[PDB]
Design a protein around this ligand. Sequence first.
Ligand SMILES: [Mg+2]
Ligand SMILES: [Mg+2]
Ligand SMILES: [Mg+2]
Ligand SMILES: [Mg+2]
Ligand SMILES: [Mg+2]
Ligand SMILES: [Mg+2]
Ligand SMILES: [Mg+2]
Ligand SMILES: [Mg+2]
Ligand SMILES: [Mg+2]
Lengths: 520, 128, 37, 72, 132, 195, 133, 101, 304
Amino acid sequence: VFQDDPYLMPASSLESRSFLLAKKSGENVAKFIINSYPKYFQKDIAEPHIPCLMPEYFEPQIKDISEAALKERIELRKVKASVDMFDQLLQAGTTVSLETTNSLLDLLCYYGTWRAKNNAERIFSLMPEKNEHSYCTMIRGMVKHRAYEQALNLYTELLNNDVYTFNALIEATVCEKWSKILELLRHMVAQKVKPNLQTFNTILKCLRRFHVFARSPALQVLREMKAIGIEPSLATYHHIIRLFDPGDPLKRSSFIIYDIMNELMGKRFSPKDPDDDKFFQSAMSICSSLRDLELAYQVHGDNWKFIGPDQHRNFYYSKFFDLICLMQIDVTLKWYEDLIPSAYSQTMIHLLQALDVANRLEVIPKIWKDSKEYGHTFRSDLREEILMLMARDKHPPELQVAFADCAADIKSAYESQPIRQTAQDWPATSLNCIAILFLRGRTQEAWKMLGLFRKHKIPRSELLNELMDSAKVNSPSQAIEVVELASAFSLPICEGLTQRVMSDFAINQEQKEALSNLTA
Amino acid sequence: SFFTKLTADELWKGALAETGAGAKKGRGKRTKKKKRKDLNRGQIIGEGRYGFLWPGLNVPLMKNGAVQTIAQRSKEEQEKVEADMIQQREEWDRKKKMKVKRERGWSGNSWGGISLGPPDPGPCGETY
Amino acid sequence: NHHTYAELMQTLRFLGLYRDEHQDFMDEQKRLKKLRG
Amino acid sequence: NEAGFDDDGSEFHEHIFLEKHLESFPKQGPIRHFMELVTCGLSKNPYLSVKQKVEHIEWFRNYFNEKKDILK
Amino acid sequence: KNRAARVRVSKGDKPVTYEEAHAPHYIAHRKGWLSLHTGNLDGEDHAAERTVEDVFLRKFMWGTFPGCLADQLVLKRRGNQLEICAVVLRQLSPHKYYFLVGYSETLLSYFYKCPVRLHLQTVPSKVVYKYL
Amino acid sequence: RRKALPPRTEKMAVDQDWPSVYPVAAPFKPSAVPLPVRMGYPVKKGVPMAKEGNLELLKIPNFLHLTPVAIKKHCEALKDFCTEWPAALDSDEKCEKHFPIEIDSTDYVSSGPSVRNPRARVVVLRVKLSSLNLDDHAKKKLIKLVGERYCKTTDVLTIKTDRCPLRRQNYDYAVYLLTVLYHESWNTEEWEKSK
Amino acid sequence: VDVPKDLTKPVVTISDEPDILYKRLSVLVKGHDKAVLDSYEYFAVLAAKELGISIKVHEPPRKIERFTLLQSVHIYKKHRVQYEMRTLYRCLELEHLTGSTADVYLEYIQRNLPEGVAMEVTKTQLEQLPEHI
Amino acid sequence: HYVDWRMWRDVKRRKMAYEYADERLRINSLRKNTILPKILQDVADEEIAALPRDSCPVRIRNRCVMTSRPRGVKRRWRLSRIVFRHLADHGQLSGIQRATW
Amino acid sequence: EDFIKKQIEEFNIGKRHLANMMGEDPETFTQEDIDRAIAYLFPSGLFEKRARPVMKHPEQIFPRQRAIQWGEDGRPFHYLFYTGKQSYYSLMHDVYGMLLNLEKHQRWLIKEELEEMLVEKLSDLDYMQFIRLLEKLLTSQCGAAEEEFVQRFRRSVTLESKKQLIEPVQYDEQGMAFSKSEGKRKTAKAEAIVYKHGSGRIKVNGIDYQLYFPITQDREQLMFPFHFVDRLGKHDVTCTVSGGGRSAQAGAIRLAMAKALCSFVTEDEVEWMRQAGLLTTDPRVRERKKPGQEGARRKFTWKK
RNA sequence: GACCUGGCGGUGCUUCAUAUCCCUCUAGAGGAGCCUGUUCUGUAAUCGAUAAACCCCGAUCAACCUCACCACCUCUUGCUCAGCCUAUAUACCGCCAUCUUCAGCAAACCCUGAUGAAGGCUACAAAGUAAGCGCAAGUACCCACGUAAAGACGUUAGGUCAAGGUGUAGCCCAUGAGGUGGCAAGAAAUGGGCUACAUUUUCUACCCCAGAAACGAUAGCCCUUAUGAAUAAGGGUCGAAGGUGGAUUUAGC
Ligand SMILES: [Mg+2]
Ligand SMILES: [Mg+2]
Ligand SMILES: [Mg+2]
Ligand SMILES: [Mg+2]
Ligand SMILES: [Mg+2]
Ligand SMILES: [Mg+2]
Ligand SMILES: [Mg+2]
Ligand SMILES: [Mg+2]
Ligand SMILES: [Mg+2]
C-alpha cells in the first residue's frame, strides 16, 4: 500500500498511520464528490456495468406513503421514518404492512440520550399488531442502546403474551450474582433456543473478571460446549485465557493451553465471531508474561487478517521482538534484519541490552543507523543507552574509528535542535562517553568538545580518568591549559593535578602553578 | 475550452513578446513593458470558492490525537479569506513594483559618479 | 463532451484544487481590464 | 469478447429465419418481395438483434397497413 | 529552419532535460514514446478516443500535481489496467502527496470505469541533460 | 526539510529472491533496483543519464519482473494443473481421422477499457469430402451447389460464418447449415435428373 | 527464515464432461519494437518448453504505412512533413494442445503481456461428426 | 462547453441524424426500391421532403475536435493536421515515427 | 576521483546481483552475457547503441581524463607541463633522440586513435609532422626496440578477400551432380539448378526460354554467362523465378546462372567472370519519390 | 579632415561551377482544346498569400453544414461564471519560406592597436586559447557510397490574430447568436496540368513473331447508373480547333 521511493517511504508508525488515514480521507472526499455530482460520472463508458463504480442514490422520491415506506429500509436514516410514522398515524391512520412496521422498528432500535428516550417512547403508538419480532427487537434496542430495566420489563411482557435476543437479555441481567447467573443459565438451556454460543461468549465477556469460583467452572462449561460440539474455540477460549489473569504464573494450565492452541493452530480456522481482533492482541499480551520462545514460534492459511488495527499489530510485534531479545541472538537479529522494513523506543532498548549481554559490539552501529534513518531523532534516551553500553567497550582497537564516526553522527543529531531546549541537558548526561570515544586517532575534536562541555558540568570519576588519559597521551602546555583550568574549576581535577604536575608540567611556568597552589 | 487551454509559459511568451520584430534592430517600444508574474507560487493549492476544509493539505491532519473530518467553511469565513488574499496579492504587487534609487552621481541618466562596489573575489581566492 | 469536461474542471477549480494557469491568466487580465475601464 | 452481452439467449434461427414473422401476406406480391429482401438484409446484418429486427418488421407492418388504401 | 518540439539555443543558462532537448525526429531513434497503446497499430480502433483521454489525463494530473513535476509522464496500458509513472520534487509533504495520489486515482477510476494505478519518483532537483 | 533515506541498493543482498521482490509487473523503481544500468545518448566527453532520473527506462517496456528464475518457479508450479495430450494423436492424418471436422475462430486483444470488437464473431470450418460423403450422386450434387467453398488440389471443403454476432450463434448455425445441406444433397429433383 | 508451513492450494474439480482438443494455437504478436517482440517470444517459448509442448518460430515481414502532411500552416505546398506507423509481426504455433493446457497457458501469457503489443489468437480444434447427418 | 457555435451546430446535426437514422434509412429504401409503386415512391419522396432540417447525415462535417478545423483532419484520429503534428512532435501519442525512408 | 572506485565496486555488486537474477554462477560470467541479459530484461527500439540501454564497466564508460600532473605544492611532474602538448612533445623528443642515435650508428594510426591514446588533442598539421617523422625513421634501418615502438602505434591492415564465394556441389538420385544458386534484382528473385552431366534444353518455371521470352535480348542475357565462359551447349539448367519485370527477371536469372556455374568452373574462370562483372547483385533501385517533387528527381517548374 | 566595420563595384588576379554559366544531351512550357488557379467585368454575394521565397496556394474539396459574404425574419445572460472569422502578423506564442545546392555561430579568458572604433592568420609557424551549438559522424532505406533526414546565428517588421490561444483597441439590442434563399457567371488577359497535332500513329486477342486503318472531344445535346433528402462513371449523336511550337523559358548526371 505504501509507495516505493525513499522520500514518500513512511519511516515510523505514527506518520504511516497519518499517511494511510489521509489516503482514506481522500477516498471519502471522492465518495462525497461523486454523491454530490452524480451526473458527471453517470456515463457508463465501460462495457461491463458496475454498481460499485456507478454514483451513489440516497434521494427520497415524491410523496408516496407506500413507496416511501418501501424506501425507508433503503435510505438508512431516522428522519424519513419519523415523517412516515407521522403521515401514517396522523392523517392516514393505517399500516402498509406488519413487516414494514417491523423493519421500521429494527432501524429505529439500531439507531437508538433523550433522543433515544423519545424514539423509544414514540414506538408504543404503533398499531396494536406487535408480534414477537417487534417485542424482541424493542428488547434488543433497549439493551444495546439504553438501560436494562426496560429490556427486562419488555421480556416479562413477552412472557405474559431468539438466540441473540436472549443474548441481549442475559447481557442486561448481568451488567456476586450467583443465583441470577445460575437460574439464567438453567432456564436458557431448558428452553429450546439452542443458541449459537454467542450467549456463552457474551456471558464470558461479562465474566471478564472473577475469582477461581467462576474461572474454573468456565473449563467445565467449555467441556460442555465441546460435548455438544458447536464451538470452534475461537473467542471464548481466548477470553478464558485472559481471565486466567495474576500473582503467580500457572505453569500447568499454561502447558495445557499451549497444547490446546497448538492443535488449534494445526487445524485450519474460519472466522465466526467479530471479536477475533482482541484475540491477537491480548493473546500476545499473555504470551509476553509467559515468556517462551517455542511458544512465540507456535503463536507465529489466511489467518493474518485478524491483526487488523495498527495498535494491536504494534503491541504484538513489540512483545514478540521483546521476548525474542530477552530469550545466541544471531537468529533473532536475522529475523529482525529481515522484518525491519516491513516492521516498525522500548524495542530498541531491549535490542541494545540483548546485544550487550551477547557482547556483539559490531552490530549496534548498524542498528542505530537504521533507527536514525527511519525515525530516531530528537530524543536522547536511546542515545544515552547506546553510549553507556558501547563505552562501559574499548576492547576493539580498530573499531575506535567507528566509535568516532557514530559519536560524530550522534553529536550532529544532538545539536540539531536549540529552539526546543531539550538538547541542553543531553551533553550533561551523555557527553562523557561521547568524548571518550572521540579521544579513542582524532583528539583535537574531543579536546575542544570537553572545552565546550566544561564551559556550558557535573564532574565524574570517569571524567577524571578521561582527562588524565588525554593529558598523558608530549605537549605540556597543551595538556596544562586544560588540566590546570579544570583544576581551578573543581577540586577533583586539582587532586589529580597534584600528581599530574610531577612529570613535566610544573617546570614550564609558575603563574599557573601559583594559581593551582592558591586553589589548593 | 479546457482542451483548448494549455500551460503558462507559452502564454507568458506570447503576452510579453520578447522577440519576433520589436526587439530586433533595437527599435524596442515607447516605454511599455509587461512585468513577469507567477500565480501558482502565490496561493496555496487548497483554497477555492467552496471552502471545504481539507485535513490532508489545508488543515493539519490530526488535532488532539483525533482524526479530522471534511467540513464546510461558512460564507463569512470564505469572504474573510477572499479579503485577506486580495490584501496579500496587493501587498505582493506593491513590493514588486517600487522605486529604484541608484545614488545620483554626476547627473541623472549618467553612469559617472556611481560605484559598483569592490571587485569580485578571484578564483584562487583574492578579496579586493 | 466538453460539457462534462469543462463543467467538471470548473467545479473542481471552485473546490480549489486544480490551479488552472490559463484561467488565472484570463481572469487576471479581466480584473485588469475592469480596473482600467 | 462476449462475456456479457448475451442478447437474452437469442438463437441463430430466431435471427435468420423470419418465415414465422412473415405470415400476414401472400407469397407472390411485391410487398412479399420487399419484405423477403428486408429479412434477407436483416439476417445478413449481425449488428442488430431479434428485437431490432422485429421492430423493423412491425414498423413496416404498420406502414403498409395504414397505406392499405392502394393494394395495387 | 523548422521550429518543432525543440529549444532555442541560449547562452548556456537554460537547464534542459533529455526529451525536450532532443528533436522530434529523434523519437524512434533516440527517444521513447510517452504512451504505449495499440490503437496506432493496424486492426485496432478507438485511437482518437485514446489520444483525447490521455491528453486530458496528462493535463488534469499536471494541474492537480502542479509545481512538483519536472518532466513528461509515462503511460503504460496493458490491456485493461492503466499505469501512470511520474517524476516529482520533494518540497511538499508526503501527506499531501498521498492524499492527492488517492484522490486522482479514485477520480480517474470512477471516470473511465477502468482500473488505474499511478506511481511517483522523488527527485531533490530536476535532472538536467545540458546547459543550452 | 524532510530527507529521503538512501536507496535499497546496499540494503539488498547478493543472495536475494528477485521473483519475490518483483512478483508482478511494475515500474523500474531505480531506488529499489540495485543495478547501475544506464540508458541515454551520451554527450561528447560524457555518459548516459544515471538510472535515477532516466525516465526513458520507464518509457520503454519493462521486464525486470518475470526473471528466468520466476518463470521456472511458476511453470513448475502450474505443472500440477496442466493436463496431458492423448498420445494416440501423433500425426495430422490420424488427428483428422479421429476428428475430421476442423473448426477455428479468432479474436484480438488490445489495451483499453473496452473489450468488445465485432471481429470476435467470425469463424470458419473445414472438412475433407473424400471420406465423409460415402457416395457419388450426392458428391456431384454438392460440388455443383458449392461455387468456391471447395479446393480439390488439397481436397478440403471450407466454409465461413459471420452472419451472427455471437460466436456460438455462428457455430451452431454453421452446424445446422451443414446438416441441412447434407440432407438436401441426399435427395434430388426431376430437373436435376434431367441434365 | 520466514518460510510458510502450509501453502494454500486452490480447489480443483474434474467435471464429468470431456475437455476440448485444440489442434493448433497460432498466436500473432504485433509490436513496435523488435527487441520487445524478441523478449516476448523468448518468454513464450521458454514457458512452452517448461510446460512440455511443441514449438516453432518465424517472423513475418514488417508492415509500414506512411502519409504526407503540410509542414507549415497557411501557404506551403512544396514543403511537407511525413510520418510512418511501423508494425512488426511475430508468429508462434503450438500443436497437439489440450483444452486445460490452453486455458492455463493463455491465462499466464494474457496476464504477462507488455503494454505496446497486440495479440491475435487463432484457435484450431477438431471435433467428431454431428448426429443428424 | 463546446469550442464554438459552429461546433454546436455540427453536434446538433449529429444528434438529429442519430435520432432519425432509423426512419431515414427505412424510407430511403422504400424510395429507392423500383418494383414497388411509383405512387408509393412519390409519397415517400414527399415524406422525406417534409422531414425536418439538420436530420440528414450529409449536412454534418467530419470536423476537428480540438480546433474545429473542418479541413485537414484524419478520419481515424479525427484530429486536425496541426494538432496531429504538435502531438507527434511532443511524443504524446505512441508508435509513430518520422518517415525518413 | 573516489567516485570511480565506488562505481567499479557497485558495478561488481550489480553484476553479482544480475548473475543471481539470470541464474548462473557469478564466478563464470561474460560481457556478452551482460549484453544478452540487459537486452532481454530491458528491450529498446532505439537504433544507435549509444542510445540503447547498456550496462558497461566504468573503465570503458568513462574516458580517460588527465590526472593531476602537479603535486599539492611546487613543481609539476612532467617537464613540458608549463606548455601544452607535453606528452607529444616528450614523444617527439625521445623519437628524435632515437633518430640521431640511428644516424650516428650509421598500418598507420589514426588522428583520433592517437588523441584517445594520449590525454590531449592536436592538429592535422602536427599530426602530419608526426607521420612524416615516423616514415623518416622507417626509411632507414631500425632496431628491435625501435620497430617495437613503431608497431605500438601501427595497426592491422585488415585486408579484404576480393573473391567470389564458391558454392558446394550437390548430389541426388540416379547419381546426378548439380549446383544450386540464387539471384535477385530490383523486384525479381530467382534460383537456378545447373546440371553438369546434362546439356541442351533449359527450363524456366517449367517452361522453355524460347517461349518464356518472346524477345531475344532476354535470351542474349541468359547466354552471356555461358558465352563468356565459352561452355554453351555443355550445361543444362532449370530455374524458378518470381518477379515483375521482364528484364529484371532476365538479370536475376543471369546472376543465378553465373553464381551456379562458378562452382563447376575453375577458380581461374571465376576470376575471369569477376573481371567481366557478372557476379555482383545490382544495387541500383528506383529512387524514392519526394513529396515536393513531381518525381524522384524532377521538380515543379520554376514559376519565378 | 582622417579612420573602424559591412554592403556595393558594368572591380583586378587565381581556382571553380556539382545540370548550373555557356558551348553541349534530352524532354517539356510559351501553338489548339479541356480541367483548375490568378488579374479583371457585373452581381446583394467571403477572406488571406497574391516576385524570386503564391497561382490545383490555405483546400489530402465549396451541390445543402464546410458558409466566415449578402437579402429577409427572430433571440437579448445570449451551450459557455457569455460570445464576436471585428482591427492590429508593425504586440505575439505556436508553425514554416529564404540565402541553405551555406559553414560557420559562439559564452568565457588573454593580447595588439600609445587601453578608438576594431583586429587576433602564417606550422621549417609571428598571440591567440576555447565551453557550447551547428556542420560533421552515426542512425532510417539495400552497404561504408547514394537517397532521405538534418541544416545554427541572422536578413526580408517575410506569411499566418481565419488551425488554436493570447496583449492592445472595439461590439457588448451586436460588429454576438438562430433559420430560408440565392451567391459562386464570364466581352476578356495570364498561369500549372491533361489530350492529342501521327504512322514510334489508331483498332482488334495477347502484352510483344499477327491482321487491318490511314488521326484527334475528359467540349456540346440526349439518356442510364453511383450516393444523397435534393457532382462523378458509362452509352448514342455531334467528329471541329488542331498539321509539333513567338522571341524566351523550365527540369534533369
Ligand atoms: Mg534629472
Ligand atoms: Mg524545410
Ligand atoms: Mg456549403
Ligand atoms: Mg460574425
Ligand atoms: Mg510580417
Ligand atoms: Mg550531415
Ligand atoms: Mg527533409
Ligand atoms: Mg510584412
Ligand atoms: Mg445523388
